[PDB]
């Protein structure tokens, strides 16, 4: 529930620590955590809001110019000086002009001309600094059980670095403890929050500082003072006897293409909502109980109300309607083959299905994991058990291949953190995570300033290099190539 | 034996040490502050070093304040303050390596 | 030369950069540097302001 149709959901099965399971929550999909005798819980990260950001260096992308003026000197005099060069609101430029004996200077060299124009800025854009503190994540979790396809089954958890751990209380189901890592989530110490005109981005530092545009420096208080004041003013000169000042055009469509690989964000009031990150939580399910045990079996009748449907991962959701007034009651349901010997094959994802109301025609939804052959969804007790025919497509080998592809994509997206998704904890997992940290630091230092094409080019180049170098470094090249080219062809 | 609150944050100095400022709500008189740096909240095993004294609150009033500084390990960790079921915790990440 | 009424402006480690209103005046010499800050000084963060 809440994760049935996500198409990017991940199943975290069982626990070997007995109590807790690590998990990395991402904005794209969600995680269904299923223990041995505990209810399946679907956990998703919904929003990350950043609060009270501090302004840094608003740039100016649309300039306007004003009353130009100029000054000039005979070929053998000093240099031209306009009294508006002592004003920090004027852009001024000095050049040499052909002068003499016709213009009113008796000498024939090159005189000095100074032209000044008053600079004003419309439509500054502004960046703000994010600190890993005062950054809040919202986690929504829900429980399986009695909920129909459409409150003791859902919970919302707010997590900030001040309170990184929380407990979601699900009445009658107990409570799920989460200890999470909010600081090291998405690196918000190199990322500014940029706004141009009611459009906000998550932008890297050291891109918001190498921009060639007239920039203020934080606290705009009175008369704004733009520092570069050029990069929007072009000083042309006519045939050695004039000078002209023009402004460059509005620069907002050049920045839109300069941004590429910078995340979009939205803003509510003083807070900025990001819809792309990843949090890491350890889930302590040791106070999670099964509400439904010690219930008598439901024996009246069951009718399929929608149909059995297949999610994108192979599981089967089934919505049933119960006819008898029995009360809180446990639903018999299974997957079977050879309906003479009803031997439970496959696994059922709902931890325990239970009908929780005492009315005539109640509704419930369960989900189950069928085997790969043809099978029968059997729901009922005896002489009134409805059976639906089910057919699952692909053998176990395809499942293992898809699992490796998902793992590779998760590694390419999360970097080293990918080793923490089933991180119950072993020497092998820790060794893999460590050597991946070393190799990731090295790879990000060497490469990582490339963008899907520089990486493809260098990948093909090094691929030829390792293919025909004939030394023992063949393997080093080809492995770096595996890395680069998959980093390209998986995103 | 009372509850602590984080008055500001656990700031990070330039050399990696954390400064934590805590507020005490109980009135037990001069009493030791139970503070540690831990991972795996299940088994609270003290990791890192606390470059502070066996931190103590001096006053005996309703709300008092304390500042202690810690030398945490290079991984992610949790500042654990308090004894049980009231121990506030903060998430803290250190960058360097040995 | 002769010098006159000095003034200064400081900011916390994670803010923008300091800006005096007398930087937009072409009669003042201004210099910008980094200063130790934090908690004691009165701004809560410990970097260089």
């Amino acid at each position, epitope marked *: 529930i809440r994760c049935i149709g996500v198409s990017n959901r991940d199943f975290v099965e069982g626990m070997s620590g007995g109590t807790w399971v690590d998990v990395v929550l991402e904005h794209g999909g969600c995680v269904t955590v299923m223990a041995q005798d505990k209810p399946t819980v679907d956990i998703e990260l919904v929003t990350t809001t950043v*609060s*009270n950001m*501090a*302004e840094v260096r608003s740039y100016c992308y649309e300039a306007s110019i004003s009353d130009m003026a100029s000054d000039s000197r005979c070929p053998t005099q000093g240099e031209a000086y306009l009294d508006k060069q002592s004003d920090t609101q004027y852009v001024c430029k000095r050049t040499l002009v052909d002068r003499g004996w016709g213009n009113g200077c008796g000498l024939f060299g090159k005189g000095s001309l100074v032209t000044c124009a008053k600079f004003a800025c419309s439509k500054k854009m502004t960046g703000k600094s994010i600190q890993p503190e005062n950054l809040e994540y919202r986690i929504m979790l829900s429980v399986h059980g009695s909920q129909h396809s459409g409150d003791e089954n859902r919970a919302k958890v707010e997590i900030t670095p001040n309170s990184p751990r929380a407990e979601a209380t699900l009445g009658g189901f107990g409570s799920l403890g989460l200890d999470c890592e909010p600081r090291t989530g998405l690196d918000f110490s190199d990322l500014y929050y940029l706004t141009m005109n009611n459009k906000h981005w998550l932008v890297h530092k050291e891109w918001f500082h190498d921009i060639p545009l007239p920039w203020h420096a934080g*606290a705009d*208080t009175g008369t704004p003072h733009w520092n570069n004041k050029e990069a929007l003013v072009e000083f042309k000169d006519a045939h050695a006897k004039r000078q002209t000042v023009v402004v460059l055009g509005s620069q907002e469509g050049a920045v839109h293409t300069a941004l590429a690989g910078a995340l979009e964000a939205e803003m509510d009031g*003083a807070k900025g909502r990001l819809s792309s990150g990843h949090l890491k939580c350890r889930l302590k399910m040791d106070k999670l109980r099964l509400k439904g045990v010690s219930y008598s079996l439901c024996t009246a009748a069951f009718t399929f109300t929608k149909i059995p449907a297949e999610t994108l991962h192979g599981t089967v959701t089934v919505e049933v309607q119960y006819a008898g007034t029995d009360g809180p009651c446990k639903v018999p349901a299974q997957m079977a083959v050879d309906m003479q010997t009803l031997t439970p094959v496959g696994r059922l994802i709902t931890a325990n299905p239970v009908i929780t109301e005492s009315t005539e025609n109640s509704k419930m939804m369960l989900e189950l994991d069928p085997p790969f052959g043809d099978s029968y969804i059997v729901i009922g007790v005896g002489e009134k058990k409805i059976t639906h025919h089910w057919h699952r497509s692909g053998s176990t080998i395809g499942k293992a291949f898809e699992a490796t592809v998902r793992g590779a994509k998760r590694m390419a997206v999360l970097g080293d953190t990918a080793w923490d998704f089933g991180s119950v904890g072993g020497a092998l997992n820790s060794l893999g995570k460590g050597i991946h940290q070393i190799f990731g630091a090295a790879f990000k230092s060497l490469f990582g300033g490339m963008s899907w094409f520089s990486q493809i080019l260098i990948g093909t180049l090094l691929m030829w290099l390792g293919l025909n170098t004939k030394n023992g470094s063949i393997s080093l090249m080809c492995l770096a190539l595996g890395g680069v080219l998959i980093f390209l062809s998986t995103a | 034996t009372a509850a602590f609150t984080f*008055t*500001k944050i656990p700031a990070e100095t330039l050399h990696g040490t954390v400064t934590v400022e805590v*507020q005490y709500a109980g009135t037990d008189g001069p009493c030791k502050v139970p503070a540690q740096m831990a991972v795996d909240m299940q088994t609270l095993t003290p990791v890192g070093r606390l470059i502070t004294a066996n931190p103590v609150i001096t006053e005996s*009033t*309703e*709300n008092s*304040k304390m500042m202690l500084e810690l030398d945490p390990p290079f991984g992610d960790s949790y500042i654990v303050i308090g004894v049980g079921e009231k121990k506030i915790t903060h998430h803290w990440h250190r960058s360097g390596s040995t | 030369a002769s010098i006159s009424d000095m*003034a*200064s*402006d*400081s*900011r*916390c480690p994670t*803010q923008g950069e*300091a800006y*005096l209103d007398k930087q937009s005046d072409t009669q003042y010499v201004c210099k910008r540097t980094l200063v130790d800050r934090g*908690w*004691g*000084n*009165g*701004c*809560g963060l410990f970097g260089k302001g």
Partner: antibody
Amino acid sequence: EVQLVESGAEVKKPGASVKVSCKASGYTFTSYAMHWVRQAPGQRLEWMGWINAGNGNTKYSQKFQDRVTITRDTSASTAYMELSSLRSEDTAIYYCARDKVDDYGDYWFPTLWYFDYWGQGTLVTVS
Amino acid sequence: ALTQPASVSGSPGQSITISCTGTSSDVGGFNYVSWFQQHPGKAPKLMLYDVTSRPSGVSSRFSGSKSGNTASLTISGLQAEDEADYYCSSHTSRGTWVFGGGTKLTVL
């Protein structure tokens, strides 16, 4: 303990100049900076400036940059504030407040508890 | 220079809050926020410094908070001897002090 006592109230016609003292007792006068704060009748408080009693540096507010001079007398443990060219707006109460000076002898950053002790006040009436 | 409410009233026994809105140079960026209480006739008395922190001989009822550009003084358990003027002050980034407009609290 710490006691800052100012001179008594004073009445002056416009155009004149007032000089109000602030005698400090109960602490080392040389290691503190004295601020002067003016409060209009039933209005906000106005910070006017400070003087570092150690070396003698002063800093005045922009509103009084060229109307106020603050001096000190260490041997007598006094801080004087002189305001010239009085106006009808200057009818207000003048307080003096201490603040600890850094251990290096400079007063760049103030200590978190700036105005821990104040003076009783002195009414200057501009008629 | 600091935006403070004109007056605030509350019945004895309940909590109340006085806000103080400043800019990114005085209250927004610095923990240099102080609250002074002034009974009529007497000089102001430092009730809170360092935002939350408060002096030695001050009742624990006064609390301080800060969010963005707004500081806030909270008085829980409003007693009798609380009718006075409350002023917020801040040390600006440029090295000057600014005070608040003033709030007259009435315990009724």
